[PDB]
Design a protein around this ligand. Structure first.
Ligand SMILES: [Mg+2]
Ligand SMILES: [Mg+2]
Ligand SMILES: [Mg+2]
Ligand SMILES: [Mg+2]
Ligand SMILES: [Mg+2]
Ligand SMILES: [Mg+2]
Ligand SMILES: [Mg+2]
Ligand SMILES: [Mg+2]
Ligand SMILES: [Mg+2]
Ligand SMILES: [Mg+2]
Ligand SMILES: [Mg+2]
Ligand SMILES: [Mg+2]
Ligand SMILES: [Mg+2]
Ligand SMILES: [Mg+2]
Ligand SMILES: [Mg+2]
Ligand SMILES: [Mg+2]
Ligand SMILES: [Mg+2]
Ligand SMILES: [Mg+2]
Ligand SMILES: [Mg+2]
Ligand SMILES: [Mg+2]
Ligand SMILES: [Mg+2]
Ligand SMILES: [Mg+2]
Ligand SMILES: [Mg+2]
Ligand SMILES: [Mg+2]
Ligand SMILES: [Mg+2]
Ligand SMILES: [Zn+2]
Lengths: 64, 50, 60, 78, 206, 50, 24, 155, 98
RNA sequence: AAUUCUGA
RNA sequence: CAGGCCUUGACAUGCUAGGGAACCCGGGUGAAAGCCUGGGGUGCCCCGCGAGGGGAGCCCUAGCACAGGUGCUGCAUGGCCGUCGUCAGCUCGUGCCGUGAGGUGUUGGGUUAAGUCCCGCAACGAGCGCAACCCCCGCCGUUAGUUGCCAGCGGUUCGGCCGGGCACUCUAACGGGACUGCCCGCGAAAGCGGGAGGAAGGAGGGGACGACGUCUGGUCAGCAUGGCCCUUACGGCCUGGGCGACACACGUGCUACAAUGCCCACUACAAAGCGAUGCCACCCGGCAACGGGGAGCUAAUCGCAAAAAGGUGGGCCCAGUUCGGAUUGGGGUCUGCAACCCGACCCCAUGAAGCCGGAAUCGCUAGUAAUCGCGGAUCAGCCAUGCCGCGGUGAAUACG
């Protein structure tokens, strides 16, 4: 494995390993699905929009 | 009203001295020191009748 | 004081330092991108008019 | 911070060299504040400018490694 | 104080670069300038025919200069002299292959860039700025078009306080990409001040 | 005397020097001011007197 | 600290290198 | 949360005792997302349980949590220009939140050097019923029932 | 045995100028290796909308440089023809080596 | 149980 | 701003008069600008050997029509931008009621993120907006192999590097896909709830997009433009200063006040970009900044390069501290003509205030907050702790 961060690759490994045995085996669905080791996980660090220090956080509102 | 002897405008940048007729275009400068100009003239106008 | 400046702006002589940027379309001097040799205003202007080769509205 | 040379303006040296050879006057205006006070300069009173006028600054051998701007404050309320 | 340029908005689809060619990060600049001054002098000695676009291609020291027009019989003259004297001028500032096309328009009232200039004139002509819109639209619409729209800026008629004269017909969805709308803008300077001419022509789709 | 809402209500100051009076003398009088009222709601244009 | 010029994070945060953060 | 009644976030089992509770607690111990460090400490402490006591960590951490959950609490309220502090039961879902939280907070209100020790000791007391977390619990309860007067509102 | 670079901005002219040059030699001599598309170099620079000042609400533009690559193995002599002679550039860069 | 906002 | 200077001018079009007509090397005074000043020296239109000429590129001086003005007016204006508001709205055509202003549609019942849809209904449709087509990220396939790979074997200087080979990864450009379609329920419908399958639900997560209009909103100093006004100076050039002052007050931020910590040596895991007087491999002198040499690089082929938090071990052991790095003295490198005002770094010595912050007050609902490090534009250098991007670790809580 390569790219990203360790506690992030470990998560991808849990996908291939969960896709390796599902391939080379039948009884690997009705017990890997209700566990979903097969899912992808769209969760990705989202773009940093302009006028927002951290993508969603905003600058300090003063008014005064 | 109508008693002024020199008005000051800022949204049309100028300063009309009604007494003499003089009219500069720098209210901001006047209002901060610049006076030595209209002071002399102011006198000239006045001392004129004595 | 805008004309005589961009005129002395052109002349790139006397000490290789003073040699400074300057928008070409407009006489501006600030935020003058090196690539187009243009300023941040005469860039959003042309770009929209398509007149800038390959420059397309970014979006990701 | 300039370990190679002394970059001291020439129109000043050329001045404190002919005027130096057989030491004489002192009336010496300038704008070369940017320059260093090379050794020997002592005596000859430089009148550094400051954006407004020429401040007649004396020259002692304690202020040699120093420039000239450092003897004519540019602001008022020092 | 809003609304992107329908043109620059469709820059990737539904309207294409009015100047397509390649340039490295070593010359794109000089060439970009070149293309500019070209359009300059051209927009000068070529208003009698009033163009509406000036495309430009390259690939190896060449130049398209494909000047689309709505009255080519003028850009040429009486056979091929004007068109010949100009190719002359263009090359005068660039030792390049100063080619030069001269397309046309089967209907200039379906090309905003033109409709714009028209009204621009009328304004400086002291015409009824209102009907001057009612008509500049009743034209393009009468001559088929899924959408028209002309917007004039302040000084309408010369009244001290500036007003914006609007008016449109058909359908004009500047929010739908696949809509190929023609945006036309041109100035109209008068004795009392400047005016603004914005025209919207709705054409294609899907 | 820093008046109610804004500005002042009264002010009086000494001018220590020579011909100070002769200088600041023509000033004696009414001074008008025109600009949109920083106080008024819609920053409308009103005239001020002093 | 991120401001102690004479330290690891010192130069790191500084983006510079020195006796306290050499290049290998 | 004006539209939908939100939706409880589900945790992940513990990579050692495999417990949803055991994890929730670690997050509290977490600072700046440094979960790797938060996790360490916990176990680093669960060891201390063994160290100083024959007790069994997972079961100790279970009794403690229980002796911190506040039966009831007094939430503010508006009677009309009136903010009478009314009493009320503490939703199980909330009950646990508070519980876990106070533990950590209190755990740090200890004079111990290391952290593990704190988390440790703080749970060894609570589980018995004599820790800082329990105090800050009894209190939260004394308020309610003490205001059992304005409790005819509840709403 | 021949490396070719087709650096253009639009792909609807490379994935048509490359795949065009491909089977324009594939069928006229030694085989060839398909058009290998290499990573793009972009210019995602942003700019502030308003003319005056409004350091917020901006608009950014990017300049994409699409690169196409195709390498004809055995350099036929029946290839320095429909290729080295038949050029179809319209707004594309072409640099070939070996 | 909490006022006031002149005059283009 | 002070001071020294220039005049049809630093830029355009055009005119009268001899010299001058491409242009080069200078000497003098001076802070520079400027002023002043000595020598090399020209095809050509072409009677003509020539004496000679007009003379186009060309170019100097005096005079001229004009230039130039970040000088005023954003209530004289264009364009562009902010904002209410990513809000569910704003209107039109005909018909109908009304003396008329207007009303109706668009109100009502149900639903949705929505004037989204459904059902009603003197209204029947439609337009501008929401949606949708565009981009990016999640599954997958096809085209494509100098990224990759003992994946299968082989030699291996034992480095995917070499034959080999593109299966994978990846790269890039065209596609497949998700539609409340399928099961159960309520419902007139729209549609809501629950289940299966699937990478993914019911808008999958991000963008771009921001209606008629509001603020006589902002900008005549980016540009443009009407009027007013300066035209040996409100134009122009140069040297020096200032915009970086300091009794103070506010907004936005950086680093901390420390053991979930700091210092040190060792060891891993990224993404998106940028690079030919640019990035610098590796050497070598130096405590180091950096300076000497020097290879590769039109750059998925070389370089910026190390990611950092993390992991291992070790040192502090609760102190104004091995916390914190302000201020200051001293010594140096580098960019630049030149860093005193006023540069960024480096090293020795200082080590300040700060033991969690009054009244108040801001941001965020998930790969978000918090936290760690990197990149770019600008650009000689740089006052970036800013702005715009990228990924690494990764929460709490939502009754209402
Ligand atoms: Mg982040
Ligand atoms: Mg603000
Ligand atoms: Mg000027
Ligand atoms: Mg000036
Ligand atoms: Mg510069
Ligand atoms: Mg306008
Ligand atoms: Mg009174
Ligand atoms: Mg009184
Ligand atoms: Mg909870
Ligand atoms: Mg009262
Ligand atoms: Mg009162
Ligand atoms: Mg009132
Ligand atoms: Mg002067
Ligand atoms: Mg205003
Ligand atoms: Mg209806
Ligand atoms: Mg109505
Ligand atoms: Mg829905
Ligand atoms: Mg609708
Ligand atoms: Mg202007
Ligand atoms: Mg200065
Ligand atoms: Mg400033
Ligand atoms: Mg070197
Ligand atoms: Mg300095
Ligand atoms: Mg606090
Ligand atoms: Mg803190
Ligand atoms: Zn510009």
């Amino acid at each position: 494995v390569r790219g990203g961060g360790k506690s992030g690759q470990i998560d991808a490994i849990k996908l291939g390993i969960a896709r390796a045995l599902v391939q080379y085996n039948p009884d690997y669905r009705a017990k890997l699905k209700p566990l979903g080791f097969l899912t992808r996980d769209a969760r990705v660090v989202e773009r940093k929009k302009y006028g927002k220090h951290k993508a969603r956080r905003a600058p300090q509102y003063s008014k005064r | 009203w109508g008693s002024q002897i020199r008005s000051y405008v800022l949204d049309k940048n100028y300063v009309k001295d009604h007494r003499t007729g003089l009219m500069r275009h720098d209210p901001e400068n006047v209002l901060d020191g610049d006076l030595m100009d209209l002071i002399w003239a102011g006198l000239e106008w006045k001392a004129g009748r004595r | 004081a805008r004309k005589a400046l961009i005129e002395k702006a052109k002349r790139t002589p006397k000490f290789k330092v003073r040699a400074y940027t300057r928008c070409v379309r407009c006489g501006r001097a600030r935020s003058v991108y090196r690539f187009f040799g243009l300023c941040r205003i005469c860039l959003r202007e042309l770009a929209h008019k398509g007149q800038l080769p390959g420059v397309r509205k970014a979006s990701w | 911070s300039l370990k190679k040379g002394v970059f001291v303006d020439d129109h000043l040296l050329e001045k404190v060299l002919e005027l130096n050879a057989k030491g004489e006057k002192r009336l010496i205006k300038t704008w070369s504040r940017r320059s260093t006070i090379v050794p020997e300069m002592v005596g000859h009173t430089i009148a550094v400018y400051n954006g407004k006028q020429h401040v007649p600054v004396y020259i002692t051998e304690n202020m040699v490694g120093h420039k000239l701007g450092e003897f004519a404050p540019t602001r008022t309320y020092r | 104080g809003n609304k992107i340029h329908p043109i620059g908005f469709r820059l990737g689809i539904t309207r294409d670069w009015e100047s397509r060619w390649y340039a490295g990060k070593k010359q794109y600049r000089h060439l970009l300038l070149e293309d500019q001054r070209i359009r300059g002098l051209l927009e000068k000695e070529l208003y009698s025919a009033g163009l509406a676009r000036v495309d430009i291609e390259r690939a190896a020291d060449n130049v398209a200069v494909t000047v689309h027009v709505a009255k080519p019989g003028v850009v040429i003259g009486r056979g091929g002299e004007r068109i010949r004297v100009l190719r002359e001028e263009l090359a005068k500032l660039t030792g390049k292959n100063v080619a030069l096309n001269v397309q046309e328009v089967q209907n200039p009232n379906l090309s905003a860039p033109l409709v714009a200039q028209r009204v621009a004139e009328q304004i400086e002509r002291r015409f009824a700025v209102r009907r001057a819109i009612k008509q500049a639209v009743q034209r393009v619409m009468e001559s088929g078009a899924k959408g028209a729209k002309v917007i004039v800026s302040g000084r309408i008629g010369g009244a001290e306080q500036a007003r914006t004269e609007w008016a449109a017909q058909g359908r004009v969805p500047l929010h739908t990409l696949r809509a190929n709308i023609d945006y036309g803008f041109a100035l109209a300077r008068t004795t009392y001040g400047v005016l603004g001419v914005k025209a919207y022509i709705f054409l294609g789709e899907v | 005397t820093p008046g109610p809402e804004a500005g002042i209500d009264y002010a009086q100051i000494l001018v220590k020097g020579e011909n100070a009076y002769g200088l600041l003398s023509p000033e004696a009088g009414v001074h008008r001011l025109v600009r949109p009222s920083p106080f008024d709601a819609s920053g409308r244009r009103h005239t001020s007197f002093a | 600290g991120k401001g102690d010029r004479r330290t690891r994070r010192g130069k790191i945060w500084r983006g510079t290198y020195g006796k306290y953060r050499p290049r290998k | 949360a004006r539209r939908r009644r939100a939706e409880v976030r589900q945790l992940q089992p513990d990579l050692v005792y495999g417990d949803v509770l055991v994890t929730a607690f670690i997050n509290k111990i977490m600072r700046d997302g440094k979960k790797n460090l938060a996790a360490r400490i916990f176990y680093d402490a669960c060891k201390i349980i063994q160290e100083k006591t024959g007790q069994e960590p997972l079961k100790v951490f279970k009794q403690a949590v229980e002796n911190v959950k506040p039966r009831m609490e007094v939430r503010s309220r508006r009677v009309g220009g009136a903010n009478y502090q009314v009493p009320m039961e503490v939703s199980p879902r909330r009950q646990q939140s508070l519980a876990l939280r106070w533990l950590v907070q209190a755990a740090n209100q200890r004079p111990e050097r290391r952290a593990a020790v704190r988390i440790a000791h703080e749970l060894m007391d609570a589980a018995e019923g004599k820790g800082g977390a329990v105090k800050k619990k009894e209190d939260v309860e004394r308020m309610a029932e003490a205001n059992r007067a304005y409790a005819h509102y509840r709403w | 045995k021949i490396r070719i670079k087709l650096r253009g901005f639009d792909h609807k002219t490379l994935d048509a100028s490359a795949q065009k040059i491909v089977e324009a030699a594939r069928r006229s001599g030694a085989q060839v290796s398909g058009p290998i598309p290499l990573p793009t170099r972009v210019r995602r620079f942003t700019v502030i909308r308003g003319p005056f000042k409004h350091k917020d609400s901006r608009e950014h533009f990017e300049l994409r440089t699409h690169n196409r690559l195709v390498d004809i193995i055995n350099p036929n002599r029946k290839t320095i023809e429909q290729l080295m002679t038949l050029d179809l550039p319209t707004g594309v860069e072409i640099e070939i080596k070996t």
